[PDB]
Amino acid sequence: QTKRRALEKIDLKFIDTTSKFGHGRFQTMEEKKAFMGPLKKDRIAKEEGA
Amino acid sequence: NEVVTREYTINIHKRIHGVGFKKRAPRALKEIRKFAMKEMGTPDVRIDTRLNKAVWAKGIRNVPYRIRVRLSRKRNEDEDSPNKLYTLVTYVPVTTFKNLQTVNVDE
Amino acid sequence: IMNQEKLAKLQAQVRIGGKGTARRKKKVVHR
Amino acid sequence: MKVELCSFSGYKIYPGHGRRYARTDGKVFQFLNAKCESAFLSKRNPRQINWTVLYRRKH
Amino acid sequence: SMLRLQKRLASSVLRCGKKKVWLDPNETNEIANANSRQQIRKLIKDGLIIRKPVTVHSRARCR
RNA sequence: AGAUCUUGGUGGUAGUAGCAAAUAUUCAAACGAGAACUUUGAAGGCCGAAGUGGAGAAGGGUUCCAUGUGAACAGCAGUUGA
RNA sequence: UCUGGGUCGGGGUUUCGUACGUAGCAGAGCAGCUCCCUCGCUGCGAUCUAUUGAAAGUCAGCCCUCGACACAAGGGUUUGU
């Protein structure tokens, strides 16, 4: 490996973790939760078991 | 025991996926019979006509996604048959499929 | 006369079809 | 780690996603997916589509 | 065994079509012995043969 | 031994081409040695009155209708049938 | 096997876009009921609002379960320097 294409140091900035099972738009669970707030499924979860 | 009866729910949608329009409902009955042969081990499976009506309730191509059946491995001590036990599968009407397990049912 | 055993089996014979079909009226034997 | 954009639907568009539309009038839009883009192209009003951010804030 | 004749005769006695003839599946043997329109007539009176009602074509939606 | 000879018979091809026009079947039961195809019942469909309906003319000539058979025929099968 | 793999169920993702029912002094209005009410209530009415990013689908070739259920040490044909 002698060309400048090789022997070039890689310095990442960002790694995509959106859902690949469709048009994902949130990187993590926690980002999704903060954007949408509590949902009905989580309302009854916090209501049935308190 | 061997005269047991059990209550199952079947994802017809999963087993039907990919069948053409004019063969979806007939395939759902071949898959229901093939299902009972698996969960009961019997080759003789009698499908109740009220179950056949439910499968064909919405026509030939818009089959219900989920069905609730009841397998009943009764005794075939009625004639000279190779199979001593048969599984009569009936139809159980349900309004929701949420949180529905496979429950043993008493007689 | 009708008792509980007779009623529970009578429901079967009068139904000759699914919902929306006419009920059976009679089944009389006479020789 | 680039500029972080917001769609016609107000959703946050991470780099490498969606498309960008520069009209002849000189204004530039960014969309998250063809659903949001074709909603904008058919001149639908985001204040009347329930899953859009501008609807949630409005109501 | 075979009730092709009895379904045809019962249609003619009931003045309906073969669509509307109901031969009792329980009394297959009893119906099978009726080889004449007179025995068919008694089957209809006794209730072993029923003329089914007309399929509903409601005009309420049109009304 | 020949005549793209005459007549009859038989091969390979070959268990091959093929049994793909007009949306579609399914459950249970009966008879039966045997049921994908017969009969009944329950469904789901189609013809949609310029019909896949009910009747005739010409033509056919007994195909009509009962009961019985399961050899051959109905290019699969048949307990069914012109 | 320190079990296994299935079928359901659950969770996640994701698709579409806010379900049925109920409620509203919401609604173009209209048809009745006024000792009445001193400003009203009885019906029909597309649609609107809340309930409700709800409802529904989601592996059949998506991800994770350890929840429920039953099942899996069983079958046949062969093979020797």
Ligand SMILES: [Mg+2]
């Ligand atoms: Mg993808």
Ligand SMILES: [Mg+2]
């Ligand atoms: Mg010669």
Ligand SMILES: [Mg+2]
């Ligand atoms: Mg020659």
Ligand SMILES: [Mg+2]
């Ligand atoms: Mg071939």
Ligand SMILES: [Mg+2]
């Ligand atoms: Mg072919």
Ligand SMILES: [Mg+2]
């Ligand atoms: Mg039609």
Ligand SMILES: [Mg+2]
């Ligand atoms: Mg005609």
Ligand SMILES: [Mg+2]
């Ligand atoms: Mg004839």
Ligand SMILES: [Mg+2]
């Ligand atoms: Mg043949």
Ligand SMILES: [Mg+2]
């Ligand atoms: Mg699931």
